[PDB]
Amino acid sequence: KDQDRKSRLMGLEALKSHIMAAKAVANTMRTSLGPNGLDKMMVDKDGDVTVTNDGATILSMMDVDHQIAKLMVELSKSQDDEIGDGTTGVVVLAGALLEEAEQLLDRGIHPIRIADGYEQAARVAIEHLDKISDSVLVDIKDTEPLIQTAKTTLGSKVVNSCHRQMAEIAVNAVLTVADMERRDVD
Amino acid sequence: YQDRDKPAQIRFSNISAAKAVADAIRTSLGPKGMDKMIQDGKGDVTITNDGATILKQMQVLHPAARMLVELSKAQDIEAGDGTTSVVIIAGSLLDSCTKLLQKGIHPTIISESFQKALEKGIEILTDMSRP
Amino acid sequence: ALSIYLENYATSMGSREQLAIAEFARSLLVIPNTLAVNAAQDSTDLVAKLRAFHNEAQVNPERKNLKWIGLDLSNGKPRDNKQAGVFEPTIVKVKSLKFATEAAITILRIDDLIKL
Amino acid sequence: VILLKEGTDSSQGIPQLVSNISACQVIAEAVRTTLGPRGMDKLIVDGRGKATISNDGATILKLLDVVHPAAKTLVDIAKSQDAEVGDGTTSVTLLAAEFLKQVKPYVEEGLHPQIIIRAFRTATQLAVNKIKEIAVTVKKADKVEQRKLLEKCAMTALSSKLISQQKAFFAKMVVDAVMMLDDLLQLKMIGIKKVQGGALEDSQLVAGVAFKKTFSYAGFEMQPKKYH
Amino acid sequence: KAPGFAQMLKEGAKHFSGLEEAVYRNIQACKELAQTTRTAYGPNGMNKMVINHLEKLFVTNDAATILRELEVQHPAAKMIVMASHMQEQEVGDGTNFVLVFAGALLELAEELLRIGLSVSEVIEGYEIACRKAHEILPNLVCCSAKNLRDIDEVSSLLRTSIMSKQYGNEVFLAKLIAQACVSIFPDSGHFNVDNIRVCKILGSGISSSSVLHGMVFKKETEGDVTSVKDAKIAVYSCPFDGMITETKGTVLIKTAEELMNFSKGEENLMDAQVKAIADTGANVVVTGGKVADMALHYANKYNIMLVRLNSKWDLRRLCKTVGATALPRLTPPVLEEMGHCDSVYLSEVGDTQVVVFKHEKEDGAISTIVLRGSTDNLMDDIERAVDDGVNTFKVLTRDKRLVPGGGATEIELAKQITSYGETCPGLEQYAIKKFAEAFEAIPRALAENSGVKANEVISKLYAVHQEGNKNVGLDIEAEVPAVKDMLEAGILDTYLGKYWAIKLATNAAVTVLRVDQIIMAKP
Amino acid sequence: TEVRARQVKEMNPALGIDCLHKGTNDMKQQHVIETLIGKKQQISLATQMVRMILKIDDIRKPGES
Amino acid sequence: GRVPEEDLKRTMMACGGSIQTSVNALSADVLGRCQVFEETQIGGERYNFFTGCPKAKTCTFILRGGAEQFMEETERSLHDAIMIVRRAIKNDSVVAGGGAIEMELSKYLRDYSRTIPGKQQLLIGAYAKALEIIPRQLCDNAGFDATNILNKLRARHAQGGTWYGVDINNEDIADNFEAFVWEPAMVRINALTAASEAACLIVSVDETIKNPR
Amino acid sequence: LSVFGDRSTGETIRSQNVMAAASIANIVKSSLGPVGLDKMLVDDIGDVTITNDGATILKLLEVEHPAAKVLCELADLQDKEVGDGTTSVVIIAAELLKNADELVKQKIHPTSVISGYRLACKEAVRYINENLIVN
Amino acid sequence: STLAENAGLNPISTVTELRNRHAQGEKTAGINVRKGGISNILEELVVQPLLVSVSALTLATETVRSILKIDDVVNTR
Ligand SMILES: Nc1ncnc2c1ncn2[C@@H]1O[C@H](COP(=O)(O)OP(=O)(O)O)[C@@H](O)[C@H]1O
Ligand SMILES: Nc1ncnc2c1ncn2[C@@H]1O[C@H](COP(=O)(O)OP(=O)(O)O)[C@@H](O)[C@H]1O
Ligand SMILES: Nc1ncnc2c1ncn2[C@@H]1O[C@H](COP(=O)(O)OP(=O)(O)O)[C@@H](O)[C@H]1O
Ligand SMILES: Nc1ncnc2c1ncn2[C@@H]1O[C@H](COP(=O)(O)OP(=O)(O)O)[C@@H](O)[C@H]1O
Ligand SMILES: Nc1ncnc2c1ncn2[C@@H]1O[C@H](COP(=O)(O)OP(=O)(O)O)[C@@H](O)[C@H]1O
């Protein structure tokens, strides 16, 4: 039923069309990356006006009717619970990988083969990050540097006026609900 | 940016005309190179795979594309071999330049950079050669 | 006869040449298929009957399997050309396959046209 | 003025068969890339805008509901294969369109359709006879327990996957979950639940029903958690 | 601007001029009707992907179903279709004989009219050849039914009619229908297709079917009673549900206790309603729609056999046999309008319980063929073979005369008629000879549908008939265009099937030739 | 490229970009450090989304007639 | 409380009770039973489960991973893994998967078609080439070169191969029987029958009829 | 690119040369064998040379196409070398191109096709020589 | 990749395989069209002088540098 006016497009013309949609969501957010990121003026359905550069808030308000772009938003919904900070880094990196993949489709690579290549490189990257990592609170429960590092990231947001008082508050909260020995915070 | 003045259109005009001469002569490379059909204006037709003969019988009118034709003649006088490989290399470098120019890199920086690769390139081939 | 032999030989080589030798085998059947149409007979059946008598010669050399069976145009039925006397020179079938192969090679190498 | 059709659209002969052959290939193309475990997915959108992503051939054909007459024949045939077996709809759909494609040039050359049917009915029975003659029964090959061979077949589908390093654990979870059931086995019975976080080896296999239990209301230190 | 249309003065209808051959146009409408069914002729007939008016897909090769679904609007084609409907009377086969033969008579008539022969002289030749064909057809009668009521005999002759409707499965269907037909032929002079009913059930395949006596109904008995010999059968069209009063009957409920009181009052009333069924001496009840849960237990309380017939045609099937008519009210104790039956019981066949109305006390002259199939479209196409198969032997209750099939009679009858036209001087020989060539279209249909050069079949069929080898027809085979004897193979057609087909086909063709102009009207 | 060359030629330890226009690179001095679980999930979720998009070649939606 | 209906109905068929909306009809008719019930601590959160129910024909498998795609991709592969184990125990007769059986039939039917004079020769051979699509699309979908594999695969069957087929993991041919890539023979038999029966319905059709509505 | 002529590349050039050689074959396909049908040859003036001999047709056949002229030059090689079999040559070569063009659509390079046809001709001459009968 | 294409091989897998053989081996690894695949070119005796490869990069790069320096063209009379 309703076969008339049915969407029908496949092959490289479809993949490049899907890649074209993901790039628009990435390029829209590529400028809002970092503390020097350009804000985004969001107008609500109720007529409100807001301005911010939060990657998560940009995607929640961005009601892209394209289906491939909706998956990019569903991805970020889970990232806020795992990473928190680099929500723009995920979308910007995905758009970069898809943009570089478009150069490979012209060379004649299959999408599933590119998928296997990135999975192999993603393991090489994840293996390299542990080598260049460093500890902070190893073998000791300390509260001084834990207040320092969290205070640096907060300085970019509107809490910059009283950024120091917020960091000490975030430490006593997690320290209260959870124990640093068990290392399972809720 | 505004980009009111657009002199880059002449770069893409010279790169496209230069890349066109390479794309035609590409398939005729090697012993198994696919032959090509040339038809003279009188009516005669011939078949050949020698890249030097094909460039002469192309009647190239663009200035930038003529530089690849005169380039192939320089290789014949100096070396006498690799006539087709030169035009294919130049077409790919210019095609690669089309990606760099879009990124905002100047032709002079690209020009000076390629000379450094040429300087290191000659050392690579000379080291792995057989005296 | 070559339609069955070359089709079996194609399975031995491989290496992006199994399909080409198989299409070379199928291409030769146009001659008995064309001779059958000109003789006002069903080319699909007579071409199939030739390949069956020739394939049986390949399965085993037993005398019950007919051998060297040709195509009679008048009666519209296969016939043994050794008895019927329908013979041709060897150089014809050899040169015609060689020259026809060189011609298709000369055209397949043409991937471009330049006019002046 | 006085015509026979008067809206009755009808065409017959070779053009009708060739039209149905091409319409059947469209259904093949819709499920051609989903063949195999590593097949490409398919995105389907209903009228409400809800998305549907799945690489199962049977689930794709149910959501299409193509209105072409010849296409409905393959869909109803494939749907019956899903109800009876639940697997092989893509193989049936691809082979049918491919049998139709190979006989397409012969149909155009004046070959009758009925002669083609005698070939499929003949070649099919010869193929079914060749399967049973060459097929092999494997019950206790090499004196190996069935729990071990089924482990090899389980990890085969799981090989070179995101859980390839720990598929030995995941391979046993499949054999354990299937062996827990009675003689009447079914895929719907053995449910699965997802829990984000934690190592891959920490995937648990509850013998009964399990759920997240978002109930966090008052009632602690009472309500004994054990019952006979 | 003049000159406009010529001979156009009646409602602006498309009146073909003398150059446009108005007669040639009504013939073309009939030729197109043949091509829609010329391919479905024979055992190798091609199926038609018919789209019902309800947007339902059905794949079949039956002629009556094709024309019933194909809205034939041309009147010149309706006449031939009316002959097909008249063909269904006095015989249940030979429908495509009317379409293929009449299409050849009209198609060949154009070759005569183009020469200049008058349409009135063409009609006289076909009428003379039809009368001559009826004199030659008795001489072609090869065998005749022994009337021994033998399943080995009835099944053997029935194979020809079953084929061309459901090919390949002609062995099972011939045995089953033979078992159903043989059980009524003892009822001398009363055989009819209305007795031999059909009941389709979703099942494994056609091989899992069988025959059972009495009016079988696929819906199992809903009640808990296994068997009951009660004659009074109460049929109701209204389902067992919440009652409504035909008068005002205003029901007001406010509190929750009053809801339970009225609910109890309804159950006490329904208990009295089902009580009234047993009070009228009737332990059987039928229902069209749903059946309530409490009323179901009431049927088991008084051991009243509950019956469910959702199909309307199943209900009317009982109204004309047992007499139980459906009333509009829900369980009115109307004992006068109830039915009468000798035995009613449940029976499990093919792993399915089916309601049965068997006639144990009475002699019994009714049967039913319980078909099994994994597709509703397949069983329906097999049902059409039962009608054309059973009706073949309804004709054999008349004069038992069989003729060869497979196009054998069509060549001999053409050969005998062609000789009559060669020696007959005058202008009628032109139409008499073409009447013989019209018979050749039927072997040409069988040959084309089997993938064989038709001209080679006619050449061989005439040679063997020239040597006197009658009863020789087309050997149905893809890779063998030769011929074989229809008697040795057992392929035989009915005499009355060819008699009434050649008669009605000629009248339909002559009736179309007599017409020369189609004119509109208004009341 | 200047930061990348410094990660090889100048010194082997990793060095970042001075986006806030502070003194210089080597964010370790600037005290700008992200979680290891953060970066591991960042490029993992990004790759998983690319594979999910690369393995889709047909978006079928019926139109209104 | 707050139990999903699917989990409740899954426990309904496992315990053998009934989900009654109103609490007024709650009695022994709807109440279920179980042998051993215990509240565990899977991943910190509590998970209720009744073990050893009377109608215990069901179970549940809780997955764990670093993200949803680790579990979703794992969810798809395990559902077929359950069917593979479910198939091997039911039907002991099997054949090599990955298109290995399809290439063997292509050799038998093609060599058989030569001995069949008539129009059936080209068609039985056409039936054979149609079986190539199953091992072909597995190579095309896996990103491999179907030419190099099919030519190397069809050559192996001629020399004596009977189980060699397509390997989705490694871009080469492999003995799918020794690799334990099996499928039920009767399920594969029903695929060819339904395929030919479906093609025969389309080939046997010559005209389409449409009642004007 | 700007030039004093015209250029055309791609797979369609192979197809254009395939359909050309296939056309020349159909002109001498029905006239194959001793029961071959005659064919007209309308010259530029108006004369009509009617004949069924394939060699006589190709000598007079004038199709202004390069691929067709290759088969005309090919005819002279077979006529001078042997003097027979020219009709089967043009027909065999036309089917090899129509079949090879289908392989090229299946991503089979012409070099792999050219290699297969060369080995097939070698083995075909071997099977022919092994199955002769001397005078 | 152009030589591999003309030899019927895959243009990508040929150069992709050779880039690993050159990282591990030497310049002996190259495309052999006589055999139709990758082989040790030093054993096949298929070599060319050094001036061909050096003069090619020298003259080609100078032409690319010359074409890159073209800002515009002026039509004189
Ligand atoms: N003080 C800083 N100095 C240098 N780089 C920074 C600083 N703060 C954040 N960044 C960089 O900006 C990027 C985005 O940071 P953040 O704004 O927290 O995430 P998002 O842009 O996704 O909201 C990170 O990748 C990080 O490397
Ligand atoms: N016999 C051969 N085997 C492998 N490669 C070859 C062979 N002959 C030439 N080549 C390669 O083909 C390229 C072009 O060779 P050549 O035809 O002499 O120059 P051009 O194509 O410029 O006229 C060279 O780079 C060489 O490596
Ligand atoms: N591990 C594997 N290796 C090779 N081939 C496989 C593997 N798993 C499945 N296949 C192939 O994939 C095809 C399709 O399998 P499946 O998805 O179960 O059926 P369908 O695609 O009809 O739903 C089968 O023909 C089988 O041969
Ligand atoms: N096995 C057979 N061989 C030859 N002819 C057959 C065979 N079976 C049936 N026929 C022919 O098919 C024709 C049509 O039969 P049927 O379909 O019952 O009537 P209609 O086509 O008028 O509906 C008959 O005239 C009969 O001769
Ligand atoms: N007596 C014959 N019987 C059957 N076939 C013949 C006979 N004579 C010639 N042929 C066929 O006719 C074809 C053409 O023969 P010929 O005219 O000598 O060559 P060409 O047609 O190329 O000039 C040959 O391929 C041969 O098979």
Numbering used by the authors:
A (entry chain E): 18 to 203
B (entry chain d): 24 to 154
C (entry chain a): 418 to 533
D (entry chain H): 6 to 233
E (entry chain Q): 7 to 529
F (entry chain E): 473 to 537
G (entry chain H): 312 to 524
H (entry chain a): 5 to 139
Paper text:
The eukaryotic chaperonin TRiC/CCT assists the folding of about 10% of cytosolic proteins through an ATP-driven conformational cycle, and the essential cytoskeleton protein tubulin is the obligate substrate of TRiC. TRiC is the most complex chaperone system identified to date. It has a double-ring structure, and each ring consists of eight paralogous subunits (denoted as CCT1–CCT8) arranged in a specific order. Each TRiC subunit consists of three domains: the substrate-recognition apical domain (A domain) and the ATP-binding equatorial domain (E domain) linked by the intermediate domain (I domain). Here, we present an ensemble of cryo-EM structures of endogenous human TRiC throughout its ATPase cycle, with three of them revealing endogenously engaged tubulin in different folding stages.
To describe the complete TRiC ATPase cycle, we produced a cryo-EM map of TRiC in the presence of ADP to a resolution of 3.3 Å (termed TRiC-ADP). Inspection of this map indicated TRiC was in the open conformation, overall similar to that of TRiC-NPP, but with all of the subunits loaded with ADP. Noteworthy, there was no engaged tubulin density was now observed within the TRiC chamber, but only the central unstructured TRiC termini density remained. Corroborating this picture, our XL-MS data showed no cross-links between TRiC and tubulin after the ADP incubation —indicating that, under our experimental conditions, loading of ADP to TRiC could contribute to a release of tubulin from TRiC chamber regardless of the tubulin folding status, and the remaining central density between the rings was indeed corresponding to the unstructured TRiC N-/C-termini. We then postulate that the dynamic nature of TRiC-ADP may contribute to the release of the substrate in this state. Still, we should mention that here we used the TRiC-ADP structure to mimic the ADP-binding state that, after ATP hydrolysis and γ-phosphate release, TRiC re-opened the rings and then released the substrate. Furthermore, our TRiC-ADP map and the XL-MS data together revealed that the tubulin was released from TRiC chamber after ADP binding to TRiC, while the retained central density is the TRiC immanent N-/C-termini.
